Amino acid sequence: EWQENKSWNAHFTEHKSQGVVVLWNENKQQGFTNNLKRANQAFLPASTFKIPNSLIALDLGVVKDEHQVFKWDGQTRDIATWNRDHNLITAMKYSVVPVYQEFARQIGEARMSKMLHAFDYGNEDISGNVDSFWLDGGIRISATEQISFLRKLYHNKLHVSERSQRIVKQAMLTEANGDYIIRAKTGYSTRIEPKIGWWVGWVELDDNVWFFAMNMDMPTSDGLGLRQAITKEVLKQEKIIP
Numbered sequence: 001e002w003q004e005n006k007s008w009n010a011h012f013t014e015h016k017s018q019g020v021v022v023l024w025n026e027n028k029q030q031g032f033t034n035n036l037k038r039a040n041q042a043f044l045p046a047s048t049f050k051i052p053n054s055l056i057a058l059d060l061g062v063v064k065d066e067h068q069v070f071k072w073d074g075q076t077r078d079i080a081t082w083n084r085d086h087n088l089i090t091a092m093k094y095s096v097v098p099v100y101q102e103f104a105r106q107i108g109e110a111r112m113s114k115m116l117h118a119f120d121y122g123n124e125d126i127s128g129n130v131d132s133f134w135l136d137g138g139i140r141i142s143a144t145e146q147i148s149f150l151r152k153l154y155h156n157k158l159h160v161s162e163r164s165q166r167i168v169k170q171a172m173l174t175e176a177n178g179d180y181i182i183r184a185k186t187g188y189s190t191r192i193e194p195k196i197g198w199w200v201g202w203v204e205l206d207d208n209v210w211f212f213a214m215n216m217d218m219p220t221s222d223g224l225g226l227r228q229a230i231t232k233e234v235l236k237q238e239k240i241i242p
């Protein structure tokens with residue numbers, strides 16, 4: 001079932017922000033959100049698309065493994081961490097768009113379209129340029145649709161090899177301590193209004209998994225840290241993490 005908890009709106013109001021957090025309790029098969037409407041509103045996935053993009057590149061052999069080095073093309077860009085060599089792990093960590101644009105060009109329109117339909121990913125529409133449609137093309141996905149996709153990935157139920165899914169979940173590793181593990185991916189969509197930030201993934205506990213997907217209005221990059229901060233406040237409130 002689904003349950004709306006508007007008390008979470010305080011975590012956005014507190015920060016002069018608007019957004020949605022969607023939680024899914026895997027053991028109980030129950031979902032929770034502050035805003036049922038926005039939970040089902042579809043936005044550009046931006047760098048959260050690096051999850052499916054990584055899966056497709058690996059399954060087709062465009063990426064051999066997580067150690068393969070993708071050499072910097074020598075073009076200086078405004079994000080210093082992009083001006084260096086990367087592998088799959090670091091390209092995900094630093095959300096290195098130009099590495100994944102090359103992935104998409106090697107994947108090609110036909111195979112990209114087939115794979116996103118096989119994944120049931122969002123509106124499955126890659127209209128636009130093959131190397132930028134997740135930033136300014138026609139593809140759209142909602143917070144609830146992110147969770148449906150992530151749940152299949154967690155259970156190795158996507159229509160790619162188990163190896164491809166294991167590698168991507170490794171690359172999603174964001175935080176780990178004695179109490180929980182977070183595998184997630186951030187997103188930042190600026191090319192089409194409304195500008196939003198994403199954070200999607202899950203929290204692994206000893207005996208349960210909580211999937212999450214959040215997006216929030218992001219008029220400037222100054223508030224990007226709120227994607228994780230707001231999500232963790234909700235997780236703390238619901239006593240999922242200490």
Ligand SMILES: CS(=O)(=O)NCc1ccc(-c2cccc(C(=O)O)c2)cc1
Pocket residue numbers: 079094095186187188190220221224
């Ligand atoms: C129109 S703009 O000038 O406001 N945006 C340009 C811009 C700003 C930040 C990034 C970036 C890079 C790496 C990580 C993250 C993140 O959110 O984790 C955001 C990319 C591009």
Ligand SMILES: [Cl-]
Pocket residue numbers: 169170173
């Ligand atoms: Cl791992």
